[PDB]
Amino acid sequence: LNLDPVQLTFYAGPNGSQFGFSLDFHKDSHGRVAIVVGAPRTLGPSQEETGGVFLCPWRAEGGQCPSLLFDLRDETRNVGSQTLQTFKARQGLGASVVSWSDVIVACAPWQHWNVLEKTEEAEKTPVGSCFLAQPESGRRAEYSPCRGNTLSRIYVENDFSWDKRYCEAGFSSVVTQAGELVLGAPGGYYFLGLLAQAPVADIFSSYRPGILLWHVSSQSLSFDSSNPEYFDGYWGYSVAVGEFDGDLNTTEYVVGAPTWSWTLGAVEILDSYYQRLHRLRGEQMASYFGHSVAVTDVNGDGRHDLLVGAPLYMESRADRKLAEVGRVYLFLQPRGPHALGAPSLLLTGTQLYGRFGSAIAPLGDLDRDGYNDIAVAAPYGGPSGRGQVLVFLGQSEGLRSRPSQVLDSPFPTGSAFGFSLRGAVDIDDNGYPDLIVGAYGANQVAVYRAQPVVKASVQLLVQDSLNPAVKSCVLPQTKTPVSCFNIQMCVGATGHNIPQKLSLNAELQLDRQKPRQGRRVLLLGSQQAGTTLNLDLGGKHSPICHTTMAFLRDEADFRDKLSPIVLSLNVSLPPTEAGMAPAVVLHGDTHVQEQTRIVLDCGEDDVCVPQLQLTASVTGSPLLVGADNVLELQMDAANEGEGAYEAELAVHLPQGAHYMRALSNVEGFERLICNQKKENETRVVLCELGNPMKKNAQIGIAMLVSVGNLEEAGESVSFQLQIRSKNSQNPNSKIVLLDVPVRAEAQVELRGNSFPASLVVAASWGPKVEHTYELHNNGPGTVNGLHLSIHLPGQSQPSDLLYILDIQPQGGLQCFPQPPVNPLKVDWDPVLVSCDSAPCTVVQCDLQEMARGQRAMVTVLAFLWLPSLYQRPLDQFVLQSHAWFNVSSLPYAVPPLSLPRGEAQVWTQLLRALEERAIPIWWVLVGVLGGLLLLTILVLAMWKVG
Amino acid sequence: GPNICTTRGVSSCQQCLAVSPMCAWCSDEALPLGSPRCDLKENLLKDNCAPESIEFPVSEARVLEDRPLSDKGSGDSSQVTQVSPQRIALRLRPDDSKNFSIQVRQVEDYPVDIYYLMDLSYSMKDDLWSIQNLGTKLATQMRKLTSNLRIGFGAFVDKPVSPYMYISPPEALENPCYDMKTTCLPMFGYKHVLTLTDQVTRFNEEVKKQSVSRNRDAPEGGFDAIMQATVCDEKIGWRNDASHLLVFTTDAKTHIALDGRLAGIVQPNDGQCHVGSDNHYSASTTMDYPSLGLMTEKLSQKNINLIFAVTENVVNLYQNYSELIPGTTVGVLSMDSSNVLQLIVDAYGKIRSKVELEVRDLPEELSLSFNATCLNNEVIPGLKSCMGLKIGDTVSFSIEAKVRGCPQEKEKSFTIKPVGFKDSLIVQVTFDCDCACQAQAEPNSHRCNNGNGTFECGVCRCGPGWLGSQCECSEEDYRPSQQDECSPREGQPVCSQRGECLCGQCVCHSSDFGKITGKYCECDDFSCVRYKGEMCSGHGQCSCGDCLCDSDWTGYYCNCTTRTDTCMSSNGLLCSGRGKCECGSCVCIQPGSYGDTCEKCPTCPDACTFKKECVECKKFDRGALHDENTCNRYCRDEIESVKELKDTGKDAVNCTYKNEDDCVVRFQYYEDSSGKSILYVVEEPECPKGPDILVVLLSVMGAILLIGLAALLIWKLL
Numbered sequence A: 001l002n003l004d005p006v007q008l009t010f011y012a013g014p015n016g017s018q019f020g021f022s023l024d025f026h027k028d029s030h031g032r033v034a035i036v037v038g039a040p041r042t043l044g045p046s047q048e049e050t051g052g053v054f055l056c057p058w059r060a061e062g063g064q065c066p067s068l069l070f071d072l073r074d075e076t077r078n079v080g081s082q083t084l085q086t087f088k089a090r091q092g093l094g095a096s097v098v099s100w101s102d103v104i105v106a107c108a109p110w111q112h113w114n115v116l117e118k119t120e121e122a123e124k125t126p127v128g129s130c131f132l133a134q135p136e137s138g139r140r141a142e143y144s145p146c147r148g149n150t151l152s153r154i155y156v157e158n159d160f161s162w163d164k165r166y167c168e169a170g171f172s173s174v175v176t177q178a179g180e181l182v183l184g185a186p187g188g189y190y191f192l193g194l195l196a197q198a199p200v201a202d203i204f205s206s207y208r209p210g211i212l213l214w215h216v217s218s219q220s221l222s223f224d225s226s227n228p229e230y231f232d233g234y235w236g237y238s239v240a241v242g243e244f245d246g247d248l249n250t251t252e253y254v255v256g257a258p259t260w261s262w263t264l265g266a267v268e269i270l271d272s273y274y275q276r277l278h279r280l281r282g283e284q285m286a287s288y289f290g291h292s293v294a295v296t297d298v299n300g301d302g303r304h305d306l307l308v309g310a311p312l313y314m315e316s317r318a319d320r321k322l323a324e325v326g327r328v329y330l331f332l333q334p335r336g337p338h339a340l341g342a343p344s345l346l347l348t349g350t351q352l353y354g355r356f357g358s359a360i361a362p363l364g365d366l367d368r369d370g371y372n373d374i375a376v377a378a379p380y381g382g383p384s385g386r387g388q389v390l391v392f393l394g395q396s397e398g399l400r401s402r403p404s405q406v407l408d409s410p411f412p413t414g415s416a417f418g419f420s421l422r423g424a425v426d427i428d429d430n431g432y433p434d435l436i437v438g439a440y441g442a443n444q445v446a447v448y449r450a451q452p453v454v455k456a457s458v459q460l461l462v463q464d465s466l467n468p469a470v471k472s473c474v475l476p477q478t479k480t481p482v483s484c485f486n487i488q489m490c491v492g493a494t495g496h497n498i499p500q501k502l503s504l505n506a507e508l509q510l511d512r513q514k515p516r517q518g519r520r521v522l523l524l525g526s527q528q529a530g531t532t533l534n535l536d537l538g539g540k541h542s543p544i545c546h547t548t549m550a551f552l553r554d555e556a557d558f559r560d561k562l563s564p565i566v567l568s569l570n571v572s573l574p575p576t577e578a579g580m581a582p583a584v585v586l587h588g589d590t591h592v593q594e595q596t597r598i599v600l601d602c603g604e605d606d607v608c609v610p611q612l613q614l615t616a617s618v619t620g621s622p623l624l625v626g627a628d629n630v631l632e633l634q635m636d637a638a639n640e641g642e643g644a645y646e647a648e649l650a651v652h653l654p655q656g657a658h659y660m661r662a663l664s665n666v667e668g669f670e671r672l673i674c675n676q677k678k679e680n681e682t683r684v685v686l687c688e689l690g691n692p693m694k695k696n697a698q699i700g701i702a703m704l705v706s707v708g709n710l711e712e713a714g715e716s717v718s719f720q721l722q723i724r725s726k727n728s729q730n731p732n733s734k735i736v737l738l739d740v741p742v743r744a745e746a747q748v749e750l751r752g753n754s755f756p757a758s759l760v761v762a763a764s765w766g767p768k769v770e771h772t773y774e775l776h777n778n779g780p781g782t783v784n785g786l787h788l789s790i791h792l793p794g795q796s797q798p799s800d801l802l803y804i805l806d807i808q809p810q811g812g813l814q815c816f817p818q819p820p821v822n823p824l825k826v827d828w829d830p831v832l833v834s835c836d837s838a839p840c841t842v843v844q845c846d847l848q849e850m851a852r853g854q855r856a857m858v859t860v861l862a863f864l865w866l867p868s869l870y871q872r873p874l875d876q877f878v879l880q881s882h883a884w885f886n887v888s889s890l891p892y893a894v895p896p897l898s899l900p901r902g903e904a905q906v907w908t909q910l911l912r913a914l915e916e917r918a919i920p921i922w923w924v925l926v927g928v929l930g931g932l933l934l935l936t937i938l939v940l941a942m943w944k945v946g
Numbered sequence B: 001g002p003n004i005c006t007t008r009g010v011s012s013c014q015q016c017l018a019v020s021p022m023c024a025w026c027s028d029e030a031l032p033l034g035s036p037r038c039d040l041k042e043n044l045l046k047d048n049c050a051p052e053s054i055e056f057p058v059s060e061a062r063v064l065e066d067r068p069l070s071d072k073g074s075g076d077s078s079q080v081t082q083v084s085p086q087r088i089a090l091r092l093r094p095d096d097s098k099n100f101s102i103q104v105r106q107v108e109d110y111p112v113d114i115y116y117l118m119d120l121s122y123s124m125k126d127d128l129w130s131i132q133n134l135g136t137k138l139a140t141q142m143r144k145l146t147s148n149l150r151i152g153f154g155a156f157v158d159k160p161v162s163p164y165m166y167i168s169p170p171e172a173l174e175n176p177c178y179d180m181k182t183t184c185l186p187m188f189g190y191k192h193v194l195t196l197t198d199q200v201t202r203f204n205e206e207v208k209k210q211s212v213s214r215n216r217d218a219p220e221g222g223f224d225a226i227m228q229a230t231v232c233d234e235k236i237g238w239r240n241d242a243s244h245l246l247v248f249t250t251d252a253k254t255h256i257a258l259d260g261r262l263a264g265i266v267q268p269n270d271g272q273c274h275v276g277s278d279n280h281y282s283a284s285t286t287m288d289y290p291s292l293g294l295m296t297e298k299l300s301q302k303n304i305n306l307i308f309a310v311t312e313n314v315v316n317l318y319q320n321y322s323e324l325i326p327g328t329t330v331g332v333l334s335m336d337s338s339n340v341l342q343l344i345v346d347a348y349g350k351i352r353s354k355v356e357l358e359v360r361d362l363p364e365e366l367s368l369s370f371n372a373t374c375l376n377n378e379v380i381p382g383l384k385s386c387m388g389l390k391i392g393d394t395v396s397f398s399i400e401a402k403v404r405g406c407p408q409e410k411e412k413s414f415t416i417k418p419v420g421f422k423d424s425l426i427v428q429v430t431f432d433c434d435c436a437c438q439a440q441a442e443p444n445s446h447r448c449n450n451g452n453g454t455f456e457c458g459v460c461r462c463g464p465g466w467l468g469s470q471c472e473c474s475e476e477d478y479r480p481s482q483q484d485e486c487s488p489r490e491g492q493p494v495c496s497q498r499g500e501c502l503c504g505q506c507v508c509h510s511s512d513f514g515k516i517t518g519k520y521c522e523c524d525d526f527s528c529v530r531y532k533g534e535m536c537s538g539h540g541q542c543s544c545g546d547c548l549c550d551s552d553w554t555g556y557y558c559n560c561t562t563r564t565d566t567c568m569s570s571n572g573l574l575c576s577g578r579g580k581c582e583c584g585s586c587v588c589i590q591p592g593s594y595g596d597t598c599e600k601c602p603t604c605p606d607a608c609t610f611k612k613e614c615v616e617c618k619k620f621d622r623g624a625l626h627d628e629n630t631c632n633r634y635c636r637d638e639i640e641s642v643k644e645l646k647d648t649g650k651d652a653v654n655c656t657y658k659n660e661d662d663c664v665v666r667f668q669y670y671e672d673s674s675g676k677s678i679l680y681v682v683e684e685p686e687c688p689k690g691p692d693i694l695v696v697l698l699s700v701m702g703a704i705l706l707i708g709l710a711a712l713l714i715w716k717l718l
């Protein structure tokens, strides 16, 4: 925000050394602050690249810096029949550099360690190491937790178990407040990742020169995992420390694994015992989610919040459906041990291939506003793709999407500016944090110094109405009575460690709306519509108030009466003096405006006394937690007294409420306008009802309010509505309070289906049949104690018509049948049958927790008993299965209201090819008998008659 | 009526035309009391003033060059013209949208050049033995569909950099495979071996001459090789007049960008070719793996159809990656790679069945809406691609371009290119926001109150405030104030208290945060829908406080999407046909169906329930609902009459159908993972023999007749 992009400090080192790859702040015993930088390609004495560390002191102009001296010679030792060799060539020393109190730790992951024994060898691999230096005591030490004397054949015979030959430890090093150095080894355990934690004091007291291999008593490493998901996970790219469980005894660790779960990206939060407390998965594969992990209390609630990056994230654009810009995720820690949910906030870059979010650096409270601030570096952001840094300020609701400030890269193309960022240190001792940004491409470091931030408050007071008839003052140098009034302007500057001398320019303009020649009011003294003054606020903690006299021109000089008079006050910094570089940056209420009017239609007393009445109605009473709740608020305002000046509707809504739309039923061309702004913590909505209205005016406004997720708002939510007016008498009407109850209810749907729909059996093991039941929590709410009972005919016996081959649940539900299903191992006129009549088998399923959106599946595979199928094959078969499910309670404070129930029936019918049932020939026999009787009687009648 | 041209305007021809998409100007002098020159063309025609000077520009979509689509391609590929028109000219008036139509056709045979990029991992050693006799078979199979074929071959192992290489022992540098006592060559990032050529003998000779290397890390950096092949067109010789195929084969994971940190490489990957005459990638040891975005961009630019051939272990991962990169076809490769020929043939058949369009050089000033049309007259709004096509099939598209305001360039151009095809349409749009009459200029005319102002097509604009019709009201003059000439429906504040009633009209002021216009100063900017700082949702533009959408969007907030590309399923039915698509999201109307396209349902009814008509038509060419022509309209599965009834299909299910003959017909449905739904049916279903009564009753009646005849002859004798 207040960072100065002009006055920057430049530090440079040897060319081609990738200087500025890693940087950090260092504090001595006397408080002197220096910058520790690591160059991973510094030329060594043997004309080979080995890396180095530089300690730049605080110089206003910068320049060359001293280089720390570390051993850069291969060390060979012989113990028994074993030979240990160390090769530091191309070790990349200074790749990761950290500082703690008076200890500087610089790690070289690429250092090579080799073990030889006669013929067999352990192979040369880049195990890496870390050099610790204490300049105050002039002490040096080395740390390498992946040094051993195990041959390669041993690992081969052990299936590469405990394969710590490729640790590359020291890629990401962190130090806790207790001084416990933690190093990440993504390549450890054969490209799986691990951590190595060790006290610094123990390392110093447990280091002996000439002892290449040693073991520390307190050395501890993470346990290897055989889960295939972790394969090629590179767990340990970024490591950070923080507090999540709320107990200060334990220090939680956060580790980023971009390649975890088949190139998915993840962030794992573990305790001090390497136990998985929580895991956060990525959004899109190959996004490199988890590249950088940061811990900071952005919201200021007292609970640490998490920031994650994904440079390789791909967005969607109209020109192209895919665009690689990167993303940044913000997670806020909820109250209690509740697990982290969806990302609190999402930030997306603009420039293509910008790798936004690669580096995130906390900056503390840069503006001293009570909220922490952060910086995000895009290596190749901006229109020119030379890198950029975006500063995000903190707030109660999180972080503002719009970047407060953007800093470009003065270096040319290929500088890779913004690769590593660090801050939250008052290097200049100016009371505000500064920033340091390295650039290995340009081989330089740029230091930005923050400037003091001053908050300005401006207040303007003027008579509500003016009476032309009353003329108390007199024009200067004459004796012409004229109306007059007093204008008061109060200006107040606040800040921390503000300069003792401060100057500001205040411009007061009267009737700025009208042209200069058309102005109606002027200043009594200067007889001008505008004036400028210089205010010295240096050391004036209390606000400075000034008063002036203004007059109104003669009536004959103008004809407009209903047009209000606008008075504007503008506060600005002094014009840039010699040398530019303003001392401080001023922000806040730097411009204020007010409107007045002439006494009109206020009665004989000439004083307006408006009387307003307000009524409010609410529609949409049922509010469901976790649902898109929409409330319709209808406010009707009426005026029974005189016209009210500057009448507006002010509405205060709960934390989870928001403003979407508002219309006016009365009048089709009113064009009502509303705005929403955060006053202190809640988004208050002000609607401009209208300028001074006519007598007996009624206005109705219907607005839509969207209520978000709410779990602690209580039984009911409250809304406040009021009428705001600038009139001296009756400035506001009666306050209206509306209580909307909140009730939680969820609906769960049970469905069932049997396959195949139609089955034919011809005329051991019979045809397969599968019945599947699905339970879905379609309702926005959540349920607990989900219980289900499925009843089927048969008891899984040979005599039973159907034999339950197997049952499979899915979704975590615990299901148990009764009687036992599948007693044998088994290495392989419709008739209605139900549990009520036929033998009943009941399977009971339970689910203590059932989150919204999850689906529980139950599948049963069975077949028709062929020995029973053969018997009586001329009768149709229709089996039935009955599922009944309900719940016990809900995870919500509101007791209301029971529910939901569910019944499901699944019918499976079997068919046979042209059953041999007795065809109704009985009708044919009856017809034949009738015909025979008719023939016989006809013959008898025609024969006896003759 | 007042309409919108007459209202919120009447200042000049530029504004008069710019207020609304369609307006007409009466340049010729006429009565000024009727507020003319800005109204519907019909209204002006009623008021006359048409001396051939009417200024009513209309957008045009004239075609510059167009040629017929070639029926077949055998030679002279330079003028295939498979896509028409080649180039068109568009002239759109400001705040107007115009649309045109294009057609896409596949011209039968088309030359094809295929580059086979293969991994040489240890597990692939056996696979290398299965390619020694693949060139002849591939040439013979491809000859049926293509007459001219080009084949190139390249091999890769892994990135040659520590720790991916066995640096120690020193003897292992030239023979890392020393533990197993085998022969191997040094690891190489990429080694092109055979350039594109039509000689099968060269391909056969090239194979069996290479070997298999060794690597430690399971993932293989094939993206580097793919990018080098795509960019190094000159090195291998890509031909712009042929179908480009790149068959990438591997049996292990693949690295991504920023993965070189382990090896110490930090330089971002560059798309420039770095392959010399040595046929090696020099920057392999110093260049990081390419990013997905750059790979996709280069693939689209070079128009290369990428075909993955991987084992079932990583087939799911490669399928997940496939949906990201456009124009990619996946496949399953056996351990012995004995199905490589069939797999590549299937991939070639499938890729040509998918058609997609891409927009290039498209400025953000204008927006495009696409409508697709497959075979038949069926049209799918909000779609730019069609599925379920075949060789020689023709599809249609409609592209509508809408512009906002008036860009200050007057010349813009863009291109619409189908995937994997050289031919593309070039669309040039020119903005004509200035009235023709303005060319007269007449900066000084005596009609502007004795030549103290500027004249323009019947309107005098004068000074910094002189707005009167005769250019006399001035800005400081007009002190007396009239009535019923500044506000409508007297009884409300003049100009809505926003402006000054001067010159007989409301002049707007306070030009802050935007511009204010209108007769009474009622329409203003900086009054659009906002959420956290955005204006008009960041997609459309707000006029008079209403945030009108641009193309591809609709709604008051202009946040609901209209295009259905995202919600398009692979079965050719929007959201799989089980639901609708709103704002790019699928809503499943049918209960029990969920997912991105509602396709993932466990409890849906079996397919055979609604496949009865298809099988009925196939087996008898008749049935109910035949008038609607539903025999082949939704069921794309292939029906075959096979009496096997013993296929071991994993994703195969038996089912039964009922016919009017009362004989149940049992048939199998197999939904292969490749999507080739196939039905197996038994021809002439065996109806059990029922009739056994007609003969019996015939015999009974014959016996009765014989008895009657015996009685008759007895009577005769008696």
Ligand SMILES: *[C@@H]1O[C@H](CO)[C@@H](O[C@@H]2O[C@H](CO)[C@@H](O[C@@H]3O[C@H](CO[C@@H]4O[C@H](CO)[C@@H](O)[C@H](O)[C@@H]4O)[C@@H](O)[C@H](O[C@@H]4O[C@H](CO)[C@@H](O)[C@H](O)[C@@H]4O)[C@@H]3O)[C@H](O)[C@H]2NC(C)=O)[C@H](O)[C@H]1NC(C)=O
Pocket: B099, B370, B371, B381, B382, B398, B554
């Ligand atoms: C590409 O795909 C999109 C998305 O489906 C299509 O956009 C739709 O196109 C339809 C066809 O035009 C629109 O519906 C129709 O279009 C009428 C415009 O033509 C007028 O017709 C009247 C008939 O008396 C004439 O007098 C006029 O002079 C015009 O010629 C629409 O008026 C109408 O739709 C209704 O219009 C009324 C009045 O405007 C609205 O109040 C009502 O809400 C409704 O929109 C008619 O049904 C359809 O609206 C449109 N979709 C939209 C705008 O979202 C493209 O047309 C496709 N591309 C091509 C080249 O066809």
Ligand SMILES: *[C@@H]1O[C@H](CO)[C@@H](O[C@@H]2O[C@H](CO)[C@@H](O[C@@H]3O[C@H](CO)[C@@H](O)[C@H](O)[C@@H]3O)[C@H](O)[C@H]2NC(C)=O)[C@H](O)[C@H]1NC(C)=O
Pocket: A785, A786, A787, A788, A885, A886, A887, A888
């Ligand atoms: C969901 O609904 C079912 C049925 O609608 C409820 O089943 C209830 O189960 C209990 C046993 O767990 C029944 O009590 C038992 O009754 C038997 C006699 O049938 C008696 O011998 C036992 O000592 C015991 O008292 C209870 O009657 C039964 N409810 C009904 C209405 O029959 C179930 O409780 C509901 N809730 C859940 C979470 O499942």
Ligand SMILES: *[C@@H]1O[C@H](CO)[C@@H](O[C@@H]2O[C@H](CO)[C@@H](O[C@@H]3O[C@H](CO)[C@@H](O)[C@H](O)[C@@H]3O)[C@H](O)[C@H]2NC(C)=O)[C@H](O)[C@H]1NC(C)=O
Pocket: A262, B316, B317, B320
């Ligand atoms: C390739 O694509 C598949 C399919 O889109 C993806 O795998 C899917 O990953 C999601 C992760 O959210 C799985 O859902 C989750 O399942 C777990 C149980 O394993 C459950 O506890 C979670 O609540 C969530 O529902 C989903 O089942 C899974 N589906 C499949 C078919 O794998 C993923 O993007 C890629 N999978 C690969 C490459 O294996």
Ligand SMILES: *[C@@H]1O[C@H](CO)[C@@H](O[C@@H]2O[C@H](CO)[C@@H](O[C@@H]3O[C@H](CO)[C@@H](O)[C@H](O)[C@@H]3O)[C@H](O)[C@H]2NC(C)=O)[C@H](O)[C@H]1NC(C)=O
Pocket: B449, B450, B451, B452
């Ligand atoms: C067009 O606008 C111009 C100003 O931009 C007008 O010029 C001024 O017009 C007034 C008309 O009353 C002139 O005043 C008269 O001029 C005579 C002769 O010079 C003189 O005796 C008096 O001062 C008389 O009031 C004024 O001189 C003239 N100014 C200039 C610099 O020429 C012009 O009149 C406008 N055209 C019209 C009204 O047709």
Ligand SMILES: O=C(N[C@@H](Cc1ccc(OCCCCC2CCNCC2)cc1)C(=O)O)c1nc2ccccc2o1
Pocket: A159, A160, A161, A162, A163, A189, A190, A192, A224, A225, A226, B121, B122, B123, B180, B213, B214, B215, B216, B217, B218, B252
């Ligand atoms: O296929 C081969 N290499 C492959 C590469 C490759 C090498 C080893 C390998 O497993 C690693 C499994 C990880 C186990 C974890 C270890 C830590 N704890 C949890 C489990 C996978 C791929 C290539 O070169 O592409 C290959 N086959 C061989 C046969 C004999 C000797 C060596 C051989 O190497």
Ligand SMILES: *[C@@H]1O[C@H](CO)[C@@H](O[C@@H]2O[C@H](CO)[C@@H](O)[C@H](O)[C@H]2NC(C)=O)[C@H](O)[C@H]1NC(C)=O
Pocket: B097, B098, B099, B100, B101
């Ligand atoms: C979009 O393009 C279509 C096709 O060019 C236009 O529809 C044609 O309109 C003309 C005259 O209006 C008719 O003669 C054609 O028969 C129509 N063809 C079709 C296929 O509809 C349509 O008017 C265009 N719409 C816009 C807004 O420009």
Ligand SMILES: *[C@@H]1O[C@H](CO)[C@@H](O[C@@H]2O[C@H](CO)[C@@H](O)[C@H](O)[C@H]2NC(C)=O)[C@H](O)[C@H]1NC(C)=O
Pocket: B531, B557, B559, B560
């Ligand atoms: C357009 O604007 C709002 C605000 O951005 C949109 O809100 C998004 O809604 C989708 C699905 O409804 C969610 O997945 C996003 O997370 C929402 N984003 C935000 C920032 O809230 C919404 O899509 C549109 N508005 C309305 C009223 O539909």
Ligand SMILES: CC(C)CCC[C@@H](C)[C@H]1CC[C@H]2[C@@H]3CC=C4C[C@@H](O)CC[C@]4(C)[C@H]3CC[C@]12C
Pocket: B707, B710, B711, B714
């Ligand atoms: C199965 C069929 C072919 C048998 C039919 C044979 C019938 C028509 C025969 C069997 C016995 C017969 C009868 C036997 C004896 C006599 C007595 C004689 O004085 C008059 C005829 C009379 C009454 C015969 C009439 C015909 C008769 C009823």
Ligand SMILES: *[C@@H]1O[C@H](CO)[C@@H](O)[C@H](O)[C@H]1NC(C)=O
Pocket: A015, A016
């Ligand atoms: C050495 O440093 C200079 C400093 O500007 C730089 O320009 C140059 O490229 C570097 N390398 C060589 C070989 O000079």
Ligand SMILES: *[C@@H]1O[C@H](CO)[C@@H](O)[C@H](O)[C@H]1NC(C)=O
Pocket: A247, A248, A249
């Ligand atoms: C840490 O543990 C010690 C020893 O049990 C305890 O005294 C202290 O309170 C703990 N810290 C906390 C609870 O913050």
Ligand SMILES: *[C@@H]1O[C@H](CO)[C@@H](O)[C@H](O)[C@H]1NC(C)=O
Pocket: A570, A571, A572, A591
């Ligand atoms: C207030 O004064 C400053 C001084 O430069 C100026 O930049 C700013 O625009 C002024 N405010 C307004 C509203 O004009």
Ligand SMILES: *[C@@H]1O[C@H](CO)[C@@H](O)[C@H](O)[C@H]1NC(C)=O
Pocket: A679, A680, A681
């Ligand atoms: C906002 O709420 C806080 C509660 O801490 C209160 O102190 C403050 O006065 C409120 N804001 C206003 C403008 O009153």
Ligand SMILES: *[C@@H]1O[C@H](CO)[C@@H](O)[C@H](O)[C@H]1NC(C)=O
Pocket: B645, B646, B647, B649, B652, B653, B654, B668, B669
């Ligand atoms: C069909 O039934 C046969 C036996 O009748 C069985 O072997 C087969 O698995 C079933 N399914 C299919 C798809 O054939």
Ligand SMILES: [Ca+2]
Pocket: A243, A244, A245, A246, A247, A248, A249, A250, A251, A252
């Ligand atoms: Ca803790």
Ligand SMILES: [Ca+2]
Pocket: A297, A298, A299, A300, A301, A302, A303, A304, A305, A332, A333
């Ligand atoms: Ca917090």
Ligand SMILES: [Ca+2]
Pocket: A364, A365, A366, A367, A368, A369, A370, A371, A372, A373, A393, A394
């Ligand atoms: Ca802050």
